[PDB]
Structure formats: C-alpha cells, structure tokens
Amino acid sequence: AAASMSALITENMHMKLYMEGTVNNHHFKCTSEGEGKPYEGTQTMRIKVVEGGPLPFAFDILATSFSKTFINHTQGIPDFFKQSFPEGFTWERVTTYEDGGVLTATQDTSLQDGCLIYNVKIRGVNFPSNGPVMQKKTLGWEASTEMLYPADGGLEGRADMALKLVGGGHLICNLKTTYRSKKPAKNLKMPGVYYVDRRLERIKEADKETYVEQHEVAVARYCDLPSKLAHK
C-alpha cells in the first residue's frame, strides 16, 4: 500500500479546481490552481471568481471548500485520503452558522496525469441579509481542530470554526462532513479516531475578493496527553 501511495502521491503535487454554486440567490463560478507538499501538510491555492463576481457575500464562507490529500499524518495514523488513490474520494459537508446561514458543499477529488483535480459544488441558504457575511464584515478564520472518526467504511469529521469580525468578536459555525473513498474497503487501512489541527490563512486578495490566495497547514495527531486507561 505504501508502495502505491509513494508512486501516486509525490512529495510535491499540483492541483486544479472548478467550483460552481449559489449563496442565497446569487450564482457564481470559481477556478483555482495551486501546489503543495502532501506529506508536510502545506498547500497554496490561487483562486479566481470567474462568474458572478464581485460576490455579494464574504469570500470567507467559501474558504473550506477549496483539499484533504494535504494533511501531514503524524504518529503512524493511517492516511485514508492518500490511500484512496488512484481511485480518489469525495467529501460532503454542511456548515451551520449560529446566525442561521447554512452552506452545503459536495466535492470530488481525482488524480489525472499526476495532477490533483477538484470539482466542487456549493449551495448556501438563509444567510441573514443584514448579517456579517452578506455585509462583508469578516476578517478570516481562527485556527481549528477537526475530529475525524471512522463510520461505515468511510470517515466523518466535526469541527467548530470561528470567523473573525470587524470590531473584534467572532461568528461561530459548525462543520459536519462525510469523507468517502472510491477505493474498495478491502483495500483500505482504516485509522481510529484522530484530530487535524489547521491554520488556513488568506495571503493575498484583489478586485473585491474576485482574486484570492489561500494557504493552509494541516497536521494530524492523536491526543498527546497521557491516558490512565492506556488509550491512544
């Protein structure tokens, strides 16, 4: 398995992305391209809003929809995402904001001629017309920890994220995600419960957020604290 993974997921990898969707009633399309180091868990994406720009909502709500192959899996945690190749995997997610916005996203991840290919679809509804997202009072995301746990041959994830607001303070949201491998389960080594620490940062933006550069670093670990019961 390691042999396959090292053949397909190189130390350096490029990605190409297409995104289409609606937020409230506003349609849009985005494309991006980027590169990263899958085993070190770092990556950059350069993103263009190619239709429906400038967006009437804060770009921040799209941030998590632009890359699971780029997680540094430490401590021998089996890598569900890198193992999934060459077949690939999908994810599906609902992000629920505490002021009512709901953003669903589904995504397909494939490997084509040594390049990672993302196809993303977005449908967000009920964002308050006079709230911080629609009025663009946001300033990016705090760091987060996602808990991943095996469920039915795939993985699920849970995270709470804090969106920084102008004037200080935060708007909180919750992420519920299902990660599904296209590789047959017999061929997968499933991890137990683990945690992915992340810091996703906006590096550059231009033209009323119709061009955005994002960088992410992601490191997977167990809980490092000692266990009285001998658990990981």
Residue numbers in the entry: -3 to 62, 66 to 231
Cite, word for word, the article reporting this structure:
Fluorescent proteins have facilitated major breakthroughs in modern molecular cell biology. They are widely used for studying biological events, such as cellular trafficking and endocytosis, and have contributed to the development of innovations such as multiphoton microscopy, genetically-encoded sensors, and super-resolution microscopy. mKate, a derivative of eqFP578 from Entacmaea quadricolor, is a bright, monomeric, far-red fluorescent protein with excitation and emission peaks at 588 nm and 635 nm, respectively. Using a structure-informed approach, we introduced a minimal set of two mutations in the chromophore environment of mKate. The first mutation, S158A, has been shown to destabilize the trans conformation of the chromophore, whereas the second mutation, S143C, was intended to impact the cis conformation.
In contrast, the single-mutant variant mKateS158A, which lacks the S143C mutation, has predominately one absorbance peak at 588 nm and emits strongly at 633 nm, giving the protein a visible red color. Mutation S158A disrupts the hydrogen bond that stabilizes the trans-conformation and as a result the chromophore populates the cis-conformation in the mKate variants at physiological pH. As predicted, the chromophore of mKateS158A at pH 7.0 exists entirely in its cis-conformation. The phenolate forms hydrogen bonds with S143 and a water molecule (Wat1), as observed in the structure of mKate at neutral pH. In contrast to mKate structures, residues R197, E215 and several chromophore-coordinating water molecules undergo major structural rearrangements in mKateS158A. Changes in the hydrogen bond network reveal a cavity in mKateS158A (and GmKate) that is filled by a water molecule (Wat3). The particular conformation of R197 in mKateS158A positions its guanidine group above the conjugated bond between the Y62 phenol ring and the imidazole moiety, presumably altering the conjugated π electron density distribution on the chromophore via a cation-π interaction, as has been proposed for mNeptune. The crystal structure of mKateS158A reveals three potential proton wires. In pathway A, the phenolic oxygen is in direct contact with the side chain of S143, which is hydrogen-bonded to R197 through a water-mediated interaction.
